[PDB]
C-alpha cells in the first residue's frame, strides 16, 4: 500500500538544495571565461527586435512565481499523501538542473548587452568564489532579495520552475475543476511572456528549457504509473535515484482529501 | 496486406523537395540580418578552445556521408519494399527539416570567424534571392563541389542526415548484422568529431541535432509498430501528413530480401 | 560449504609482500645493466608525439586509484564472505606482479627523456642497493610519498592496479548497479588515458597490461567457477598456489551483504 | 555434412593476398617516419647481449620454413577435405597479419645496428613508395630472394609462419605418428632460435608473437569444433569473416586421407 | 606385513659406507698409474669445445645436490616407512658405487690439463696411500670442503646421487604433486649442465652415468613391485645381496605420510 | 598367419646400406678435427699393458666373423620364413649403427699411436671427401680388403656384429644342438680377444657395445613376442619403421624346416 515514508523525504530534500548548491558554484566559474561580456550589441532575435525592453517585467514573472507556489503550497497542504507529492517534487527538480549544469559547462550563451553595471567580477581566488557562491546560493535567484544583478545564460531555470508547479498543481486536481487549470496556464503563460520582454533570455533558451522539463516529468510520470522499475529490465532507467525513492509506492496515487489539524 | 502504392512515394518525394526549396530560401532570408557576422569573437567553448582548428577535418564529413549513401542504396536496391522504406525516410527528412528551419528562423547561431573570405553580401532585392538560393539548392549544401562559402546556422544538417542515414540502415537489416551497424556508428561518430574539429559549428549544435534525430525516428518507428494511427484517438499524431501516407501498411514490415532484375 | 579460513587469507598477504618486496629489488637491479637511459631519442609512438605533456597528469592516475580502492575498501566490508574475496585478490596480485618481474627482466624497455632528475647513482655494492629497494617498497611505488625519482619500465603497475580493481568493484556488486559500474569504467578509462597523457609508459605498455590483466582475471574466476581443481587432471593448472586456496571453496560465491558489527 | 566449397576458398586466397599488400605497404610508410633508426645503442636484452652474432643463422629460420611448407604441402596433397584446410590456413594468416600491421603501426621497434647499410630512403613521393611496397610484396619478405636489405618491426614474421605451419602439422596427421610431431616442434623451436641468435628481433618480440599465433590457433579451433557459429548468440565471434567461411562445415572435420589421381 | 627390521637398515648403511670406503681407496689406486697426467690435450669433443670454461658453475653442482638432498630428508622424516626407503636408497648406492668402481678400474678417463695446480704426487708407499684415501673419505669429495684438487675419473658420481634423489622425491610422494617434480627435474638439468660447463667431465661421463642410474632404478622398482625374487627361479638376480634385504617386504610400499613426534 | 612380405624386406635392406653409407661419410668427418691424432701415448690401461701387441689378430677377427657369416647363411637357407629373419637382421643392424653414429658424433675416442704410417689426410674439399667414404663404404670395414688404414674409435662394429649373428643363430635353433651354440659363443669370445689383444680398441669400447646391442635385440625380440605395438599404447616405441616391418607378423615365429628348391 502507499506507505508515507517519512525518512526518505529529508534525503530528497537534501537532494535539490545541494544540487542548487552546486549549480550555483558553477554559475561563478562560467563568468570568469569572458572578462567584459558586456561590449556584444544584441544578435537578432525576431522575437528581441519585436517588444522593447521592459525594466519592471522581470519582477512580475517573479510574483507569478510566488503566488503559483502559494496555490501549490496550499493543494500540498490539504492532502492526504503529502509525503510522495513533496518528494517528487525534489526529485524531479533535482536532475533538470544537472542538465542545466551539463550544458553551461559545455558552452555560454548569455544575454548581449543589458544589466551593463554589473559589479563585482575579477575574482582572482581560491576561497573569495565561495563567498560568491554563498551569495547566489541564499538569495534564491529573486531580485526581490537581490543577488540576480548580472546576465544570465542559456537554458533559464525561471521558466523550468514555473512550468514544473504548473503541472503538478494541474496533475493533482481533480478533473471536474477546469477553472484553476487554465488560470494556472495563463500565469504561467504570462510569466514565459513577460520573461521574454525583459530582454533577459533567447527565444531558443526558453524553447528547450519548456521541452526538457515537459518531457521529463511526463517520462517519470508515466513509469510511476506503470511501475516498471520492479516489472522487468524496462529501460535500464538513468534517473538519479527513482527505484530508491518509488520502491514503497505501487500503481497511481489517488487525489482524496482531509483536514490535517486535529480540530475541525 | 502490404501493398506498393507507387502514386505515394512520388508525392512524398516532391513533398521533401518542396522543402528542401524552403529551407535553401530561408538560409538566403535570414543571411541579409547582420551585415558585417565576422567581427565578433567566439563564444566561450569547451571543445572549439582547445582543439586547433584542422583545415581538413570538414571534408572527411563528406565523404563519410557518400560512403553511407552508398550503403542505403545498396540496401535500398534488394529490399522488396523499396517503395515503402523510401516513402518513409522522405516523411522524416521532411518533418526534421521543418524543424531545421524553425529553429533557424526563431534565432540565428553562427560560428562567429570562419568562411571570412567569402564574397556577394548585401543581396537586397527580389529577385536574386532566389538566383542565390537555386545557386544554394543545387550544390546539395556540400563544399566539395563548392557552393556553402559563407558561414552556417543552427540546428546543422550534416548532422541530421548523417545520423538518419546511420539509424536507417540499422534498422532495416536482419538483427544478426550487428557488424555493419558496429562500422556506421564509427562513422557517424567519425563524422560528427569532424565537424566540431573544424570550428564549423558549436558544441551544443551538434548535440541537440543528434538527439532530435534519434528521438523522432525512434518515437517515429514505435507508432508504426503498434498502429496507433488507427487504433484509436491517441493522442492526436502531429507529423505532418501522418495517417495519410501510411494508411495502407498494417503490421511490422518484413525482413526478407529478394532480387527485382529477372537476369538471374 | 563456504569456510571462512582466516590462516589462509594471511597466507595469501605475506605472499604478495613477498612478491611486491621481490619486485622492489629486481626494479633496482635492472636499473644498474646501462646507466644513462636518458641521452637517446623517444621511439616513433603515435600517442606520445601527438599529445604535449601534462606536468599533473600522473598524480591524477593515482587519485583515481585511491577513489576505486576506497570504494573496493567499502564493499570488502558490508559482505558475508570478505575472506574469500581478500584472499582471491592476492592471490592474482601476486602472479601478475610475477610476470611483471619476468617481463621487465627479459628486456628493458623505458622512456628516454623523462624523469632526467635521476643523477649520482653508481650503486656498486651489495648492501647500498638494499637499502634503494627498500625505499621504494615502503613507499607504495607512488609519485605522491615520493620514490619515483627515476623511470618506469615494461609492463606499467599502475595499469595493472587499476583494471584490477575496477573489474573487482564490477564483479562483487549486484547485478542491477549499472551506474557504479559505469563510475568505475570511466575511472578506469581516464587512468589509464593519464599515464599516456604524462609521457611516463609506451603505447605498447599499456595495452598488453591492460589484455594481460583481464585475460587473468577472466580465467581465474571461469577456473573458480568450474571448480576443476578436484573434479580431474583437467589440465595442470599453472597458477601459483591456486588449489591450496580454493580447495574449501566450492560452487560460486554469492552476494549476501550484511553489516559485521555487533551492534545493529 | 562436409560440402567442398570451391568457390570459397579463391575468396579467401584474394583476402590474403590483399592483406600481405596492405602489410607491406603498411611496413614501407612506417620506415618514414624515423630516418636513421641506426645511430642508437641496442636496448638492454639478456639474450642479444650473451649470444655473439651469427652471420649465417638467418638463413637456416628461412630453410625450416621452406621444409615445414613442404610437408604441409605433402600433406594437404592427401587429405580429403583439403579444402577446409587451405580455406581455414588463409582465414587464420590473414588476421594475424592485420593483428602485426596494427601493432606496428603504433610503436616502431626495431634492432639498432643491424642492416646498417639501408641508406638512400627520402622516398617523398606516392609513386615511389609504391615500387618498394611491391618490390617487398612480390618477393615474399624472405632474405634469400634478396629484399631484406632494411630492417623488421615489432610482431616478428617469421615466427608467425613457422609456428602456423608447425601447429597445422601436428593438428592434421593422425594421432599416432608420434616422431613427425617431434620433429615438427624441433623445427620450429630451432627457427626460433635462429631468428633470435642473428640479432634481428628482440626476446619480447618473438615471445609475444608465438604467444598471439598459439592462442588465436587454439581458440580457432575450439570455436570451429563448438560450432558456436551457429549454436547461439553466445559471443559475438570478433574473427573476420568466420561465420562466412564455416557455415557449411558442421561438427569436426575427420582424418580420411586418400589419393586425387585416378591412376593407380 | 610391512614390519620395520632397523638391524638391516644398520647393516644396509655399513655396507654402503663400507662402498664408500673402496671408491676412496681405488681412486688413490688408479692415481698412480701416469705420473703427469696433465700435459696432452683434451681429446675433441662438442661441449668442451664450443662453451668456455667458466669457474663458479662447478659449484652450483653441489648447490643444487645439497638442496635436493635437504628435500629428500624431508621426505624420509614425514613417510612412515622411513626404514624401507633408506635401506633401498643404500642398497642402490652400494651397486652404481661398485660398478663405478668397475669402471675406473678397467680404464681411466679424466681431463688432460685441468687442475693443473695441485699438488701432492708420487704417494709411493704402503701407508701415506691410506692416508690421502682418508683425506678424500672425510670430505665426501666436494669442492666447496676443498679435498678433490686434482683432476677426476670415469663416471661421475655427482649425476648418479643428483639423479637418485630426483627418481626418489618424484616415485615415494603421491602422483598428484607435480610441481616439486618439475622442480626437481629443473634442479637437475641444471646440475647436469654445471658439472658440463665446468670442463670437469666428457659429455659421455654424463650421458651413461644417468642413463645407467634411471634404468636401474626402474628395473630395481619393477622388480620390487611384482615380487619376482621368491616367485620363481626368474632370471637369478645379480644385485649383490638382493633377497636378503627384501625378503621380509611383500606388495607395494603405499604413499601415506605419518609424524612420528609424540608433540602435536 | 605369417605371410612373407618379399616387397618390404628390400626396403629394409636399402636402409641398412644408407646407414652404413651415413656411417661411413661421419667417419671421415671426425678424421678431420684432429690432424696428428697419433702423437699421444696408450691411456693405461690394465689389459693392454699386459698383452704385447699382435699384428695378425686383426686378420683372424675378421676370420671369425666370416665363419660366422658362413653359417649363419648356412641357417638362412634352409628356413621357412627367411625373409623374417632377413628383415629383422636388417632392421636392427639399421638402429645399433645409428646409435653408433651419434655416439660417434657427440665424442672421439681413438687407440693413440698404432697405424703410425697410414697415407691420406690433410683433405681440403668438399668433393674428395666423398671419394674417401665411397672407399671407406665400398670396402666393408675388413683389412683383407685394405680400406681401413688409419685407426677405429670407440663403440667397435666389429664386436656389435659378432654379437648380433651370434645371437641371430642361437636364438632361431630349437633348444636340441647344444654342441653348435657352443662353438659360436667359444668363436665370439676369440673374436673380441683377438680384437682386445691387437691393440685396436679399448675394454670401455667393446663392453658398452656388447651390452647395447645385447639389450637392444632382447627388447625387440620380446616386444615382437608379446605383439604390444597394437595391443595398447606400451612404451611409446622410438624404434626405426618397427610398426610398419612387424605389423603383419603375430606370435612367435617358430622353425620348422623345408628344402628350398623343387629337386630334393
Known amino acids: 500500500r502507499l506507505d508515507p515514508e517519512y525518512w526518505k523525504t529529508i534525503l530528497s530534500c537534501i537532494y535539490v538544495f545541494i544540487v542548487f548548491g552546486f549549480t550555483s558554484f558553477i554559475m561563478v566559474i562560467v563568468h570568469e571565461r569572458v572578462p567584459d561580456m558586456q561590449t556584444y550589441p544584441p544578435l537578432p532575435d525576431i522575437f528581441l527586435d519585436s517588444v522593447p525592453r521592459i525594466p519592471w517585467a522581470f519582477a512580475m514573472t517573479e510574483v507569478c512565481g510566488m503566488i503559483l507556489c502559494y496555490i501549490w503550497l496550499l493543494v500540498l497542504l490539504l492532502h492526504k499523501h503529502r509525503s510522495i ?28 548587452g543589458q544589466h551593463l553595471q554589473c559589479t563585482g567580477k575579477i575574482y582572482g581566488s581560491v576561497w573569495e568564489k565561495l563567498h560568491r557562491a554563498f551569495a547566489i546560493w541564499s538569495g534564491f535567484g529573486m ?24 503541472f503538478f498543481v494541474t496533475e493533482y486536481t481533480p478533473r471536474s475543476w477546469n477553472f484553476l487549470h487554465t488560470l494556472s496556464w495563463v500565469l504561467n503563460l504570462f510569466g514565459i511572456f513577460f520573461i521574454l520582454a525583459a530582454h533577459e533570455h533567447y ?41 530508491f525513492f518509488e520502491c514503497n509506492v505501487n500503481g497511481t496515487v489517488p487525489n482524496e482529501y482531509c483536514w490535517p489539524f486535529s480540530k475541525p
Chains 1, 2, 3, 4, 5, 6 share one sequence.
Do not use: E, K
Not at 531580485?143 to 504548473?166: A, E, I, K, P
Not at 521529463?216 to 527513482?242: C, D, E, G, K, V
Open 85 to 112: 507529492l513533496l518528494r517528487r517534487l525534489c526529485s524531479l527538480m533535482g536532475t533538470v538542473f544537472l542538465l542545466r549544469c551539463f550544458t553551461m559547462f559545455v558552452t555560454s550563451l548569455s544575454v548581449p
Open 143 to 166: 531580485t526581490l532579495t537581490g543577488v540576480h544583478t548580472c546576465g544570465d545564460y542559456m537554458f533559464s531555470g525561471h521558466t523550468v520552475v514555473l512550468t514544473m508547479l504548473n
Open 203 to 243: 527565444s531558443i533558451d526558453v524553447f528547450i528549457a519548456f521541452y526538457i522539463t515537459t518531457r521529463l516529468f511526463l517520462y517519470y510520470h508515466t513509469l510511476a504509473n506503470t511501475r516498471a522499475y520492479q516489472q522487468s529490465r524496462r529501460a535500464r532507467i538513468w534517473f538519479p535515484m527513482f527505484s
